[PDB]
């Protein structure tokens, strides 16, 4: 049966096909400079240089980050983060020695310096990611199952006469209704429906996530100390829509244990309740024991796909502290209750009301932190207009703190024709109007778009008026994303302040085949190598072209996925023909994979060959050793060859021809040449 | 020979620690997702290849603001899928049952509400870049066409 | 089984090369792809040369066919020209099947008096006895799909630019006529009604 | 405290249907020729049915694709009979193979295309066809494997 | 005296403008220097040929006697920072009243002496107002 059969998920890639990468260096540079001129104090210069070095040897990936600052009066190199990451396939996890961060959701975000080992959800196929119910069933006889959503079908497959479990259902949003319909050739159809609502803490049935972190604690503040701590987090998906998740934080002075459950009740919604019990030592010698209970509720689609509600409550009793409170200085009011209420309502297929309300109460100080936000976005044809309102009454007498904003974006394509050849089609007009509900007014109108053939050079010119002061401000920027780097130039003009920004970003790879420059890198990169094909643009990317050696680096590549690297044959030299214009790679996290391409440099030839006044038979192989070229006879003895010399000979192996040919310089200059040559 | 006394010189100034805002040129941004096929987006939940883009901040100091995050405000195609954007209709023709989604450094989706902020980040002294990923999300079969969507993002400092 | 990148390839005038993808979804399949281009009358033509004309594809792979022009600007520049691009996949007692896929190649002159958007609406219907002829004043090849004459579908139609295509009509059909044309990307324009002008 | 806006521009393009013909390598098996059975022009054989699947594409584009069969005919009179393509000791004589519609109408091999009437099964779009050996006067004990070409016009 | 100091030199204010704490985060860092000048009128070459300027002010620290102090007010003033005056040659001047600047040859009539004013922060700079004042002596040889 299907349940016993080791069926694989949709989009599943075996771990053997995953490419570890290549042994190569790496250096990403980001230089920025600001010249600020004011009538009061003349002029000044600022320069910030971010340098991320790296080295990928074997499977280990070493990364180092450094910063340089120069003001106009000294040079200051400053380390930030160094880490040696790696991925372990048998454990389906990722290990990191050195600096890093704690991705804990059950606990609070912590920056640390030590060994971390955490399960990664990215290595799993995209089908079985997130939360989605798995379907268990018994089918009497051979059956056809059509797990179908309220809109359309999702999973259609055959099932043998036996138990079957289906776990390939996609996320399909936060809430959904799956109708399982089984049809057998003998009996009548059997249908049953199941609703589901998801919470980020929930996991799939039989899904396990873990995180083990150990090492010292680091923070930007110099007041806090650097204590060593251990943090373990576990998330498990029980059968029947439950989730059990726990955690443990431990240090010299702070010991906290977190336990929680979550449920997918179906039509009612989704729930997640957890309790954290902590014994802490304050900056002084005092010891405090406390608890904090967090509650999360997600309602299903109210009405008919109109309203969605989220309720997040958190009650922290007197004596519960996070890790920062303990790790404060040797000598340096808790939250009684925090409530979040989010309501989203969609109307007219266009307007989307978002209402957010946060309400926090402390201990002793009965002051209440209230935060009410109401946004309305509407996309009426090309015109997109958003109206937002916000209010914030905080504990420290922040008053009403009301704010209102109105942003309208109108593309020029609303007026220009569909097939306009002008560059004005790649542009839009933006208008922003901000009230502070006290007379403080900010208007800003401008245009922006792209004006290059690859849409690399992006321009944005905006004027604005600030009124109580009455200030007119101009702001014009140009960003160019070329095949060697990104260069941005900006000019901000004010009443008495003139700012000129100039920045260059780039990346350098010291791979085996020399040094390759390119756009700034983003974790995983693909090194496209097509030697002999100079200035060849790659597809689906902006301003990524090969250099004079044919080597280029792609900025971003999806990890553990099937992504296509294609060379745009249209914008390629007529003398060069690619044997393969599309390649497929499966990179690992933080890895450099070579998408090797073969390019023939000689002229493109179309030869009609005849033997004994008879065209060569179909399927015959024509090869030329003078320039290592090959082709297959199409019909009437017509064969296509790429990369051939002006004068030479070819040989045909139908099942042993030799054919001599010569071409004129006009033929060599032509794009594609056609000729005839007889066998021996 | 002779030493006499002049007047006085009065120096007027003010030492100020400056805050930070969005980098020039990163205010209005455009991202080209490329070309995707119905084979890639043929059923609900199918996602295309993510395209990276960064938001830059300049003149940020650790003392004034240790951490920062952003929140994207947009239009949802339906109340069920509130974490995906909505594509605008075009005269030539707009794709049906498809939208734009935004991810984080952790690979998690973002609620398009104006208050759901993303994960916190550490602010380096000066230039700071926050990366994000744009993706295609199909709710059912995706008819071919042109997909263009817009999103408004606001930044908070902690 | 091989598949093409698009069901409708538009080749603008003035260029030299057009790119079309051919992909093999089957993991274990060896194929020989042979491609060519014929005119509107189904006759093999040398006006467009597809490179490589014949190549061997092994396993799951995607390759690019480059359609190279040879018109020498001898085609009319007033209206679109129609060609058929054929791709045949030879699967290199039992009979073997070779699949031919034919797609529509539109040689589109660079400068045209009408944008592609307005070409869909400006179709006229001349109805008579057993005839529902379609007049297309617009300079675009129009593909009319599910032409319903009130309550019954007639058939698919392809009306040439500045042309009067003919479709037979049973006398039982109603007066109301509804249709919808296929746009550039292959989707279906929302249904319009057809006037008798 | 405040930011700007980001826009995403992209294209979603339709893809032509992937055609799968019966078993792997686009091969459909047929029963062996019976010398006693194949005697007269009207003599036939067991009707082995196969199906062609147009997968990895939308049902809307799949259903609008015209369908035709073509190849070589053994004789001018036998327009609907494929000519056997075998040059060896196993080549049979005075026989052929016929491709047949659902109801039982023979399919012309000239190339006159028609609608596809794809059945939207639970999996994908499918079209069933029929194949049977056809005698034209005599039978020979040989492997009469033939070849036919399948034409799909993506309207 | 051999020369006359104009009022625009006797009583005038020079503004250094706002600065960034990053530009003065560490000790020894200096901000951008602005330029002012003092005008001498009716200078007689026969009476005197060389002119010099000595600056008198309040040094911040005994170890740093070339930096003026801040006398804005009793609160809301920048800390651990001062201002510096550089002569024509670009060197710092001692705030002692007898430490004169570089000797400059005097031309008959009207002459000008340019000086630069900049910031100088020890330790770590802190936000706040920064105001200073200093008296000077001119010597004619």
The total of other beta-carbon atoms located within 10 Å of residue A9's CB is: 13
Closest-CA distance of chain E to residue B120, Å = 24
Residue of E nearest to A39 (CA): E17
Closest CA to C81 of C165, C161, C183: C161
Say if residues A616 and A637 touch (Cβ distance below 8 Å): yes
End-to-end CA, chain B? 63
d(CA A526, CA A509): 11
Contact criterion met (CB < 8 Å) for A633 and C55: no
- The CA dihedral of D104, D109, D113, D119, to the nearest 10 degrees, is 40
Measured between beta carbons, which residues in chain D are less than 8 angstroms from residue A407? 5
Q: Which helix (H) or strand (E) holds E24?
A: none
- Is E84 strand, coil or helix? strand
Q: What is the CB-side half-sphere exposure of residue A430 using CA atoms within 13 A? A: 24
Q: List the single residue in C88, C96, C101 with the smallest CB-CB distance to D154.
A: C101
- Is E10 strand, coil or helix? helix
Closest CA to B148 of A555, A446, A383, A539: A383
The DSSP letter of residue A355 is: E
Measured between beta carbons, which residues in chain A are less than 8 angstroms from residue E20? 44, 46, 71
CA D85 to chain centre: 16
- Any idea which residue has 């003998």 for tokens? A186
DSSP track, A642-662? EEE-SEEEEEEE-----EEEE
- Phi and psi at A165, nearest 5°, equal -120, 130
Q: Which residues have a Cβ under 8 Å from the Cβ of B96 and sit 6 or more positions away?
A: B142, B143, B145, C187
Q: Domains in chain A, start-ordered, CATH in brackets? A: 126-197 (2.60.40.3110), 603-678 (2.60.40.2070)
DSSP track, E62-76? SS-TTSB---S-SSS
Closest-CA distance of chain B to residue E55, Å = 10
Q: List the single residue in D19, D145, D147 with the smallest CB-CB distance to C1.
A: D19
**CB-count burial class (<10 Å; 0-12, 13-18, 19+) for C111:** exposed
Closest-CA distance of chain B to residue A464, Å = 14
Say if residues D122 and D59 touch (Cβ distance below 8 Å): no
Say if residues A619 and A633 touch (Cβ distance below 8 Å): yes
Contact criterion met (CB < 8 Å) for B150 and A409: yes
- Any idea which residue has 């049953």 for tokens? A192
The tokens of A607 are what? 């030869």
Contact criterion met (CB < 8 Å) for C95 and D20: no
The DSSP letter of residue A559 is: T
Q: How far is CA A502 from CA A30, A32, A46, A491, B24, in A?
A: 11, 6, 10, 9, 10
- Is A92 strand, coil or helix? coil
Total beta-carbon pairs less than 8 A apart between chain B and chain E:
121
Residues in chain B: 158
Contact criterion met (CB < 8 Å) for B31 and D8: yes
Q: Which residues have a Cβ under 8 Å from the Cβ of D105 and sit 6 or more positions away?
A: none
d(CA A1, CA A164): 7
According to the 3-state scheme, what is the secondary structure of chain B? CEEEEEEEEEEEEEEECCCCEECCCCCEEEEEEEEEECCCCCCCCCECCCEEEEEEEEEECCCCCCEEEEEEECCCCCCCCCCECCCCCCCCCECCCCEEEEECCCCCCCCCCCCCCCCCEECCCEEEEEEEEEEEECCCCCCCEEEEEEEEEEEEEC
d(CA A327, CA A108): 14
Measured between beta carbons, which residues in chain B are less than 8 angstroms from residue C184? 92-93
Closest CA to C83 of C22, C154, C20, C3: C20
Say if residues A505 and A485 touch (Cβ distance below 8 Å): yes
Which ranges constitute the DSSP H helices of chain C? none
Q: Which residues have a Cβ under 8 Å from the Cβ of A223 and sit 6 or more positions away?
A: A328, A329, A332
Judge E/C contact: 3 or more CB pairs < 8 A: no
**CB-count burial class (<10 Å; 0-12, 13-18, 19+) for A330:** exposed
Q: Which helix (H) or strand (E) holds E7?
A: helix E7-10
- Phi and psi at C178, nearest 5°, equal -125, 140
* For chain C, domain boundaries: 2-108, 124-193
Total beta-carbon pairs less than 8 A apart between chain C and chain D:
125
The tokens of A311 are what? 């309720």
Please state whether beta strands A672-678 and A603-611 pair in parallel, antiparallel, or not at all (unpaired). Answer: parallel
Q: Which helix (H) or strand (E) holds A629?
A: strand A629-632
Contact criterion met (CB < 8 Å) for A604 and C51: yes
Residue of C nearest to B95 (CA): C187
The total of other beta-carbon atoms located within 10 Å of residue A146's CB is: 18
Q: Mutation test of the interface with chain C: which of D10, D11, D18, choosing the one with the most C Cβ atoms within 10 A?
A: D18
B144 touches chain C (CB under 8 A): yes
Task: Classify each residue of C149-178 as buried b or exposed e, where b means 16 or more C-beta atoms within 10 Å of its C-beta.
Answer: beeeebebbbbbbeeebebebeeebeeebe
CA angle at D50 for the pair D45 and D51, rounded to the nearest 5°: 155
Residues in chain A: 680
d(CA A501, CA A506): 17
Contact criterion met (CB < 8 Å) for B96 and C184: no
DSSP track, A2-33? TTTS-PPPTT---GGG-B----EEEEEEEEEE
Please state whether beta strands B21-22 and B99-103 pair in parallel, antiparallel, or not at all (unpaired). Answer: unpaired
Say if residues D45 and D132 touch (Cβ distance below 8 Å): yes
Contact criterion met (CB < 8 Å) for B17 and E68: no
Closest-CA distance of chain B to residue C128, Å = 33
Say if residues A551 and A512 touch (Cβ distance below 8 Å): no
d(CA B101, CA A173): 12
Residues in chain D: 155
The DSSP letter of residue A189 is: -
The tokens of E68 are what? 């003026």
Measured between beta carbons, which residues in chain A are less than 8 angstroms from residue B130? none
Residues in chain E: 141
- Is A130 strand, coil or helix? coil
Say if residues A164 and A295 touch (Cβ distance below 8 Å): no
d(CA A541, CA D21): 36
- Phi and psi at A365, nearest 5°, equal -70, 105
Say if residues E30 and E118 touch (Cβ distance below 8 Å): yes
Does the N-terminal peptide bond of residue C52 adopt cis geometry, omega within 30 degrees of 0? Answer: yes
d(CA D48, CA B29): 61
Contact criterion met (CB < 8 Å) for A46 and E17: no
Please state whether beta strands B28-37 and D5-13 pair in parallel, antiparallel, or not at all (unpaired). Answer: parallel
According to the 3-state scheme, what is the secondary structure of chain D? CCCCEEEEEEEEECCCCEEEECCHHHEEECCCCCCCCCCCCCCECCCEEEEEEEECCCHHHHHCEEEEEECCECCCCCCCEEEECCCCCCCCCCEEEEEECCCCCECCCCCCCECCCCEECCCCEEEEEEEEEEECCCCCCCCCCEEEEEEEEEC
Please state whether beta strands A208-217 and A110-119 pair in parallel, antiparallel, or not at all (unpaired). Answer: antiparallel
Say if residues E81 and E13 touch (Cβ distance below 8 Å): no
Q: What experiment produced this structure?
A: cryo-EM
Q: Mutation test of the interface with chain E: which of A34, A39, A40, A41, choosing the one with the most E Cβ atoms within 10 A?
A: A41
Residue of B nearest to D18 (CA): B39
CA C42 to chain centre: 13
The total of other beta-carbon atoms located within 10 Å of residue A265's CB is: 14
Alpha-carbon dihedral sign for residues A127, A130, A133, A138: positive
Q: What is the CA radius of gyration of chain D?
A: 21
Measured between beta carbons, which residues in chain B are less than 8 angstroms from residue C185? 93, 144-146
d(CA D9, CA B31): 6
* For chain E, domain boundaries: 1-141
- Phi and psi at A665, nearest 5°, equal -60, -30
Task: Classify each residue of C95-106 as buried b or exposed e, where b means 16 or more C-beta atoms within 10 Å of its C-beta.
Answer: bbbbbbbbbbbb
d(CA A156, CA A143): 11
For the segment(s) C124-193, the CATH number from 3.40.50.300, 2.60.40.420, 2.40.240.10, 2.60.40.10 is 2.60.40.10
Please state whether beta strands C178-181 and A514-518 pair in parallel, antiparallel, or not at all (unpaired). Answer: unpaired
Residues in chain C: 197
Say if residues C63 and A581 touch (Cβ distance below 8 Å): yes
Closest-CA distance of chain A to residue D95, Å = 26
- Is E52 strand, coil or helix? strand
d(CA B31, CA A664): 47
Q: Which residues have a Cβ under 8 Å from the Cβ of A330 and sit 6 or more positions away?
A: A225, A283
Say if residues A120 and A94 touch (Cβ distance below 8 Å): yes
According to the 3-state scheme, what is the secondary structure of A471-527? EEEEEEEEEEECCCCEEEEEEEECCCEEEEEEEEEEEEEEECCEEEEECCCCCCEEE
Contact criterion met (CB < 8 Å) for B13 and E129: yes
Say if residues E120 and E38 touch (Cβ distance below 8 Å): no
| Assigned architecture for domain C2-108 | Sandwich (2.60)
Closest-CA distance of chain B to residue A558, Å = 7
The tokens of A413 are what? 């394509």
- Any idea which residue has 């479990």 for tokens? A165
Q: What is the CB-side half-sphere exposure of residue B32 using CA atoms within 13 A? A: 17
Please state whether beta strands D147-154 and C94-108 pair in parallel, antiparallel, or not at all (unpaired). Answer: parallel
Beta-bridge partner residues of A396:
none
The answer to whether C2-108 and C124-193 have equal CATH topology is yes
Closest-CA distance of chain B to residue A256, Å = 22
Beta-bridge partner residues of A622:
A631, A652
Beta-bridge partner residues of E132:
B11
Task: Classify each residue of A458-472 as buried b or exposed e, where b means 16 or more C-beta atoms within 10 Å of its C-beta.
Answer: bbbebebebeeeeee
Closest-CA distance of chain E to residue B63, Å = 11
Q: Strands, E, within A58-174: which ranges?
A: 60-71, 76-88, 93-102, 110-119, 135-138, 143-149, 153-159, 163-166
**CB-count burial class (<10 Å; 0-12, 13-18, 19+) for A329:** exposed
d(CA C145, CA C154): 9
D37: left (phi over 0), alpha (psi -120 to 50) or beta: alpha
d(CA A101, CA A115): 11
- Any idea which residue has 């059950």 for tokens? A106
The total of other beta-carbon atoms located within 10 Å of residue A571's CB is: 15
d(CA B95, CA E62): 76
Judge B/D contact: 3 or more CB pairs < 8 A: yes
Q: List the single residue in B12, B17, B63 with the smallest CB-CB distance to E13.
A: B12
Closest-CA distance of chain B to residue A251, Å = 23
- Any idea which residue has 């054919």 for tokens? A659
d(CA A18, CA A560): 7
**CB-count burial class (<10 Å; 0-12, 13-18, 19+) for C130:** exposed
Q: List the single residue in C3, C116, C185 with the smallest CB-CB distance to B145.
A: C185
Q: How far is CA C140 from CA C67, C135, E24, in A?
A: 21, 12, 69
Closest CA to B42 of B156, B133, B148, B138: B138
Contact criterion met (CB < 8 Å) for A418 and C53: no
Q: Which residues have a Cβ under 8 Å from the Cβ of D48 and sit 6 or more positions away?
A: D28, D29, D30, D31, D130, D131, D132
According to the 3-state scheme, what is the secondary structure of A276-334? EEEEEECCCCCEEEEEEEEEEEEECCECCCCEEEEEEEEEECCCCCCHHHHCCCCCCCC
């Amino acid at each position: 049966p299907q349940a016993f059969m080791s069926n694989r998920a949709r989009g599943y890639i075996p771990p053997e096909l995953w490419d570890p990468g290549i042994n190569a260096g790496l250096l990403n540079y980001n230089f920025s400079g600001n010249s600020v001129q004011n009538r009061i104090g003349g002029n000044s210069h600022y320069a910030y240089l971010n340098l991320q070095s790296g080295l990928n040897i074997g499977a280990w990936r070493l990364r180092d980050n450094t910063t340089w600052s120069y003001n106009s009066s000294k040079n200051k190199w400053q380390h930030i983060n160094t880490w040696l990451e790696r991925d372990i396939i048998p454990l389906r996890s990722r290990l990191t020695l050195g600096d890093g961060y704690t991705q804990g959701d059950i606990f609070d975000g912590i920056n640390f310096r030590g060994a971390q080992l955490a399960s990664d959800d990215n290595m799993l196929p995209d089908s079985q990611r997130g939360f989605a119910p798995v379907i268990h069933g018994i089918a009497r006889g051979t059956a056809q199952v059509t797990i179908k959503q309220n809109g359309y079908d999702i999973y259609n497959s055959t099932v043998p006469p036996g138990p079957f479990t289906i776990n390939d259902i996609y996320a399909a949003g936060n809430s959904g209704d799956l109708q399982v319909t089984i049809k057998e050739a003998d009996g009548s159809t059997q249908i049953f429906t199941v609703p589901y609502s998801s919470v980020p803490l929930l996991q799939r049935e039989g899904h396990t996530r873990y995180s083990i972190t150990a090492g010292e604690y680091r923070s930007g503040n110099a007041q806090q100390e650097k204590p060593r701590f251990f943090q373990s987090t576990l998330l498990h998906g029980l059968p029947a829509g439950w989730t059990i998740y726990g955690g443990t934080q431990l240090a010299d002075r702070y010991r906290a244990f977190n336990f929680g459950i979550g449920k997918n009740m179906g039509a009612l919604g989704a729930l997640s309740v957890d309790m954290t019990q902590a014994n802490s030592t304050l900056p002084d010698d005092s010891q405090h024991d406390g608890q904090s209970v967090r509650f999360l509720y997600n309602k299903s689609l109210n009405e008919s796909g109109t309203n969605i509600q989220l309720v997040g409550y958190r009650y922290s009793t007197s004596g519960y502290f996070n890790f920062a409170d303990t790790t404060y200085s040797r000598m340096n009011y808790n939250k009684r209750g925090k409530l979040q209420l989010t309501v989203t309502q969609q109307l007219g297929r266009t307007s989307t009301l978002y209402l957010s309300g946060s309400h926090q109460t402390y201990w002793g100080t009965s002051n209440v932190d209230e935060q009410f936000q109401a946004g309305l976005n509407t996309a009426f044809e090309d015109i997109n207009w958003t109206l937002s309102y916000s209010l914030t009454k905080n504990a420290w007498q922040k008053g009403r703190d009301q704010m209102l904003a109105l942003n309208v974006n109108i593309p020029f394509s609303h007026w220009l024709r569909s097939d306009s050849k002008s560059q004005w089609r790649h542009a839009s007009a933006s208008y922003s109007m901000s009230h502070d509900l006290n007379g403080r007014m900010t208007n800003l109108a401008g245009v922006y778009g792209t004006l290059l053939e690859d849409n690399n050079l992006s321009y944005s010119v905006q004027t604005g008026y600030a009124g109580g002061n009455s200030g007119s401000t101009g702001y014009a920027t140009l960003n160019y994303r070329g095949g060697y780097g990104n260069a941005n130039i900006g000019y901000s003009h004010s009443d008495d302040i003139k700012q000129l920004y100039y920045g260059v970003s780039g990346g350098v790879l010291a791979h085996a085949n020399g040094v390759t420059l390119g756009q700034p890198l983003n974790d995983t990169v693909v090194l496209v190598k097509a030697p002999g094909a100079k200035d060849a643009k790659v597809e689906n990317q902006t301003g990524v072209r090969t250099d004079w050696r044919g080597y280029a680096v792609l900025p971003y590549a999806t990890e553990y996925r099937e992504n296509r690297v294609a060379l745009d044959t249209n914008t390629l030299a007529d003398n060069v023909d690619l044997d393969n214009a599309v390649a497929n790679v499966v990179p690992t996290r933080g890895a450099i994979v070579r998408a090797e391409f073969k390019a023939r440099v000689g002229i493109k030839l179309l030869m009609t060959l005849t033997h004994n006044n008879k065209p060569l038979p179909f399927g015959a192989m024509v090869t030329s050793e003078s320039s290592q070229s090959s082709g297959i006879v199409a019909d009437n003895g017509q064969v296509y060859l790429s990369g051939m010399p002006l004068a030479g000979k070819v040989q045909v192996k139908w099942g042993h021809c030799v054919a001599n040919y010569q071409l004129p310089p006009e033929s060599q200059q032509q794009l594609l040449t056609q000729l005839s040559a007889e066998c021996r | 020979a002779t030493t006499v006394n002049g007047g006085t010189v009065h120096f007027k100034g003010e030492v100020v620690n400056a805050a930070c805002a969005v980098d020039a040129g990163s205010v209005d941004q455009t991202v080209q997702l490329g070309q995707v096929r119905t084979a890639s987006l043929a059923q609900e939940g199918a996602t295309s290849s993510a395209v990276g883009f960064n938001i830059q901040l300049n003149d940020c100091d650790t003392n004034v603001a240790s951490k920062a995050a952003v929140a994207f405000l947009g239009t949802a195609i339906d109340a069920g899928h509130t974490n995906v954007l909505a594509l605008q209709s075009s005269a030539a023709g707009s794709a049906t049952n498809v939208g734009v989604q935004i991810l984080d450094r952790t690979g998690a989706a973002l609620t398009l509400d104006g208050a759901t902020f993303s994960s916190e980040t550490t602010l380096n002294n000066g230039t700071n870049t926050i990366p994000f990923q744009a993706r295609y999300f199909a709710t059912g079969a995706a008819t071919p066409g042109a997909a263009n969507a817009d999103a408004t993002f606001k930044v908070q400092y902690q | 089984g091989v598949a093409l990148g698009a069901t409708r390839v538009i080749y603008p005038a003035g260029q030299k090369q057009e790119q079309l993808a051919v992909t093999n979804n089957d993991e274990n399949s060896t194929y020989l792809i042979q491609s060519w281009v014929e005119n509107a009358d189904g006759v093999k033509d040398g006006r467009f040369i597809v490179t490589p004309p014949l190549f061997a594809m092994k396993g799951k792979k995607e390759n690019t066919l480059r359609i190279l022009d040879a018109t020498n600007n001898q085609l009319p520049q007033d209206r679109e020209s129609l060609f058929w691009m054929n791709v045949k996949a030879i699967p290199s007692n039992t009979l073997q099947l070779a699949i031919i896929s034919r797609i529509k190649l539109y040689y589109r002159p660079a400068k045209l008096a009408l944008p592609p958007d307005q070409a869909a609406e400006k179709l006229r219907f001349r109805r008579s006895a057993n005839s529902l002829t379609l007049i297309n004043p617009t300079p675009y090849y129009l593909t009319v799909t599910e032409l319903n004459a009130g309550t019954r579908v007639l058939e698919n139609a392809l009306v040439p630019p500045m042309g009067e295509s003919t479709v037979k009509l049973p006398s039982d059909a109603g007066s109301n006529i509804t249709y919808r044309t296929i746009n550039d990307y292959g989707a279906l324009t929302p249904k319009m009604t057809g006037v008798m002008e």
